[PDB]
Amino acid sequence: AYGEWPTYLRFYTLKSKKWESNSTGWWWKLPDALNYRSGFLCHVQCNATKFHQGTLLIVAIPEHQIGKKGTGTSASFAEVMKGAEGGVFEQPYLLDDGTSLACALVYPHQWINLRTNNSATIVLPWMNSAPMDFALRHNNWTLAVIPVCPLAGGTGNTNTYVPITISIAPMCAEY
C-alpha cells in the first residue's frame, strides 16, 4: 500500500447504503463527503449475517474524472458533487472512466469477501500537486465500492437489503 501514516504539511458515519443482488455500485468524493491538507482514512463494513454471499471491491482512485456514455459533454455540478449522499456507477465495468474494473486494483484496493471478512480500511494521504487546497471545488480522492459478485442468501422477509456502512476520518487535517 501507499505506506504513509495519515499526515499533513473524530469519525463521520454516512447513512448505510441498501445493497441488493442487482446493485451496480456507489462512490463518494473527498473532501465533498465531509460537507484542508489532510490524511483521510476510510473504514467500511457490511452489516451482513453469516448466511449471506457476494463480495465487494473497495477502491480509492486519485483524480477520478467520472466520464459518461453517448456525448462529448462534460459532467455538470449535480453529477459530480454528491456530499455524503454519494453517486451511483452508471457503468461499473468501465469504472465510468472508460477503464476496466478488472484493472482498478492498480489503485489502492481492498476486498470485502463475506467468507473472510465483512470489514476493510484504507489510508488516503494527500496527493494534490498544490500543498493545501482551500476552495470547495475539487476532490483529490474518490472512494468507490463495487459488487464484483452479486449479493445472495436468505429468503422472503430478509429482502436482500444487506446494508453497507461507510466511515471516514480526515486524520491529520490542517488549515
Binding site: 463521520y12 458515519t13 463494513q45 465483512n118 466511515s167
Partner: peptide, 29 residues
C-alpha cells in the same frame, strides 16, 4: 446524532456496550 458526541455500537464483537456520563439532556440511540 452523527455530529453529536457518539459511539456506533455494532452488535458484532461487543454484545454489551458501556458509555460514561461526566459531571443534563439525554442519552439517545
Amino acid at each position: 446524532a452523527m455530529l453529536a458526541t457518539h459511539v456506533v455500537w455494532d452488535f458484532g464483537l461487543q454484545s454489551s456496550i458501556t458509555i460514561i456520563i461526566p459531571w443534563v439532556g439525554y442519552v439517545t440511540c
